[PDB]
Amino acid sequence: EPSPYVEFDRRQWRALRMSTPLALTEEELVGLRGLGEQIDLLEVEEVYLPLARLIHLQVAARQRLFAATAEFLGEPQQNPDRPVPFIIGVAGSVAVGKSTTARVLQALLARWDHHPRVDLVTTDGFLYPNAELQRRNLMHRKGFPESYNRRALMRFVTSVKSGSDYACAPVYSHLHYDIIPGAEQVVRHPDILILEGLNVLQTGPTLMVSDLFDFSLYVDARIEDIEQWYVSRFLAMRTTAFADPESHFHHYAAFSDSQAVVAAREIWRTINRPNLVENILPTRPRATLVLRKDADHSINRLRLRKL
Amino acid sequence: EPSPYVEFDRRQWRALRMSTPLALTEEELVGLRGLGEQIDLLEVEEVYLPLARLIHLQVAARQRLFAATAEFLGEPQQNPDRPVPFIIGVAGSVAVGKSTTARVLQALLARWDHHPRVDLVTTDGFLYPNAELQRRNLMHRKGFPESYNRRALMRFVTSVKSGSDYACAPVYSHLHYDIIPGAEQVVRHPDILILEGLNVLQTGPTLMVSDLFDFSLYVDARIEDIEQWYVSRFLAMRTTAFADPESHFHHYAAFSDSQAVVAAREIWRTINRPNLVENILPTRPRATLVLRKDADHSINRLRLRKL
Ligand SMILES: Nc1ncnc2c1ncn2[C@@H]1O[C@H](COP(=O)(O)OP(=O)(O)CP(=O)(O)O)[C@@H](O)[C@H]1O
Ligand SMILES: Nc1ncnc2c1ncn2[C@@H]1O[C@H](COP(=O)(O)OP(=O)(O)CP(=O)(O)O)[C@@H](O)[C@H]1O
Ligand SMILES: CC(C)(CO)[C@@H](O)C(=O)NCCC(=O)O
Ligand SMILES: CC(C)(CO)[C@@H](O)C(=O)NCCC(=O)O
Ligand code: NA
Ligand code: NA
Ligand code: NA
Ligand code: NA
């Protein structure tokens, strides 16, 4: 029975690296790695390099589709210094390492021969501010689709891919756990734009940012492993993020291992796990490429959409 | 404010015809026109010709995307006699003329220089048989998403676009209003496949046929106009389709105008209108091109997705 997908073990995927250069050192990789992630240079060569290759191939191909529609339209033939921004979506659960995935990806692509402008934007800045969330009774639903200003987000991406000189996104503060008044992230006609979020692959009764993605990535892992990574991260943050007196969750720092685990599980069970099962996972079927992470965090299986 | 869409009046769209040949006569056009449709050769030149042009441009462009993924994969470079079938989805409400639209489209594309194999398949054959619908209490829901064997339909399209030598679809009988035992429609690696249906543009928690569309068409019109066209068609069929003694609805033939109108409105209000409003219309935002039909049935406005 035919399928729109084709599986790959790390062995078969790495082969597709061909002669792709590794323009990243250990120090740099470290500056991209997130707390808990085990990503090393080897994984960057066997997994992220074939990926950067596939993407640069598609960035060329996909360039025709916009050219053809330009020809048909009798429009002047597209300006070289301003191509149509290639949009890459990176989705997945909280604590699955998708942000490291996104950061690494940004680093690699930025280091491609002609050095393309490659921006990275997370959906955090599109979260409604706490005051607005309380108003909507969503202070315990940060992460769910309804906790974001989806129109604003769609506006942003639409603006960047339609060729605007600049588009701005609000900025979120994890330290203060809320939108930062007046903060803007400015994106200026990048060549590649990576949008990272939880449900960015969602589809619906209106055109959404997923309909604008030229390529999508979904960082996947067994649910029980993700919970472990989540709890583990929570405990570790008692001495990093929560240690800061300025942290909204500074009082989590004095928790004991037991208390920490209990609190992390509650948060996971009441927010993150439901959001993963009801909203995030249902979108995995449409991802161009799925990166499967084993319990040890390593990518040992990939799924690609050939259709 | 930027947009993923660009509007067109008949005047601006026809200009895009360029030097496209009209390989269709009146007799032929007639043999494609449905009861109630006002389509003439002029509309075929001003609306369907620019469309056939745009499509053949995209069929070339879109060919790269599959080539690039073939290159990346180190796969042998695609066989010329067997390209990747281009999939066109045609959606819209019952009685909006989308089938005529599909038939005309098939005729034009089949008449393109190198004469490509262009098949047309409606989703009717994927409807569950009456016995199965009764079992599910859906005998008054033919047309709704749940009245079709969506897995089968997805299997069919997946098979055709994955390059199978042949794929078969069940056949529906409008005369007998049910699936025809043993009837199969065989599709053999066509170059272009047009899938026509009511909710074929729907998206969901699994990869669906809309995710495989390389181009989609949505035939639109004001809801009140569609109801008129629907009722009008119902009355006219008292002397065509319902006139046949073998017709499942043969007893509608003896209805008076008044009785006919009452019955048609009930059917429209209880089945077709709800299905249009809850399921069909919500999918319009993703259509590549929307053909707007005025009350007189003429296409005087078009909406194209540039993003
Ligand atoms: N609770 C938090 N505190 C501080 N920074 C956070 C954060 N959650 C996310 N971030 C930012 O996003 C990055 C995510 O890195 P990583 O890929 O290792 O985890 P993740 O994004 O898969 C799970 P998360 O939903 O917690 O971000 C963090 O390194 C930091 O840059
Ligand atoms: N009730 C019916 N009786 C006979 N044929 C029908 C039919 N409904 C659909 N068909 C077939 O599909 C064609 C549809 O033609 P047209 O484009 O004019 O209407 P339509 O498809 O937009 C509304 P419908 O949902 O009734 O098919 C009919 O001409 C016939 O070939
Ligand atoms: C689980 C950690 C430490 C890491 O993901 C972090 O996401 C966290 O605890 N944040 C505050 C509670 C929450 O995750 O909603
Ligand atoms: C309205 C007509 C005549 C034409 O669409 C036809 O669709 C019809 O009446 N069919 C049987 C009832 C129904 O439309 O469900
Ligand atoms: Na920038
Ligand atoms: Na496809
Ligand atoms: Na055929
Ligand atoms: Na697009």
Side-chain angles (χ1 to χ4, degrees), chain A residues 199-244:
Chain A
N199 292 287
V200 293
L201 284 181
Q202 277 200 306
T203 175
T206 182
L207 220 50
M208 288 170 76
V209 298
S210 62
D211 297 296
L212 261 42
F213 291 167
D214 299 292
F215 189 96
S216 70
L217 227 54
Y218 185 106
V219 183
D220 193 32
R222 279 159 48 203
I223 196 164
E224 27 287 295
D225 293 318
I226 298 183
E227 169 178 344
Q228 180 63 59
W229 301 344
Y230 178 83
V231 174
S232 180
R233 248 166 78 69
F234 190 89
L235 265 66
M237 286 175 82
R238 287 176 299 180
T239 45
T240 53
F242 308 153
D244 189 322

Side-chain angles (χ1 to χ4, degrees), chain A residues 1-6 8 13 16-18 50-51 53-54 57-58 61-66 68-69 71-74 84 154-155 157-159 161-162 164 203-207 211-212 281-283 285-287 304-307, chain B residues 1-6 8 13 16-18 50-51 53-54 57-58 61-66 68-69 71-74 84 154-155 157-159 161-162 164 203-207 211-212 281-283 285-287 304-307:
Chain A
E1 175 172 61
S3 164
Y5 309 118
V6 48
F8 294 83
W13 178 270
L16 290 302
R17 168 185 180 177
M18 301 310 192
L51 174 54
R53 185 177 159 247
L54 172 50
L57 282 178
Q58 292 303 329
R62 172 141 305 222
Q63 207 54 229
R64 293 304 189 180
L65 299 179
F66 282 92
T69 293
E71 178 174 349
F72 163 74
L73 287 177
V84 170
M154 179 55 171
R155 255 180 272 121
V157 179
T158 290
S159 171
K161 196 172 182 174
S162 66
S164 68
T203 175
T206 182
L207 220 50
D211 297 296
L212 261 42
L281 263 166
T283 64
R286 292 190 297 290
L304 174 69
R305 278 192 62 180
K306 57 180 180 174
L307 288 179
Chain B
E1 175 172 61
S3 164
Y5 309 118
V6 48
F8 294 83
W13 178 270
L16 290 302
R17 168 185 180 177
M18 301 310 192
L51 174 54
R53 185 177 159 247
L54 172 50
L57 282 178
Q58 292 303 329
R62 172 141 305 222
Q63 207 54 229
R64 293 304 189 180
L65 299 179
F66 282 92
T69 293
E71 178 174 349
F72 163 74
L73 287 177
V84 170
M154 179 55 171
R155 255 180 272 121
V157 179
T158 290
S159 171
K161 196 172 182 174
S162 66
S164 68
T203 175
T206 182
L207 220 50
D211 297 296
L212 261 42
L281 263 166
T283 64
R286 292 190 297 290
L304 174 69
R305 278 192 62 180
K306 57 180 180 174
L307 288 179

Side-chain angles (χ1 to χ4, degrees), chain B residues 25-91:
Chain B
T25 66
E26 278 195 357
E27 212 255 330
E28 304 183 309
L29 176 49
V30 165
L32 298 182
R33 187 191 315 182
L35 198 61
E37 297 303 314
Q38 305 288 298
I39 189 184
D40 50 38
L41 277 197
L42 187 55
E43 195 170 74
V44 180
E45 309 168 313
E46 307 198 308
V47 178
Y48 291 71
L49 291 191
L51 174 54
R53 185 177 159 247
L54 172 50
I55 288 184
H56 268 94
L57 282 178
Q58 292 303 329
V59 177
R62 172 141 305 222
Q63 207 54 229
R64 293 304 189 180
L65 299 179
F66 282 92
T69 293
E71 178 174 349
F72 163 74
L73 287 177
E75 268 184 352
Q77 308 309 350
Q78 191 63 306
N79 158 52
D81 298 61
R82 295 284 283 278
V84 170
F86 192 85
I87 319 295
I88 305 180
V90 173

Side-chain angles (χ1 to χ4, degrees), chain B residues 188-207:
Chain B
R188 307 172 181 291
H189 57 265
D191 295 297
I192 288 175
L193 171 61
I194 297 171
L195 185 78
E196 185 220 311
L198 299 170
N199 292 287
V200 293
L201 284 181
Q202 277 200 306
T203 175
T206 182
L207 220 50

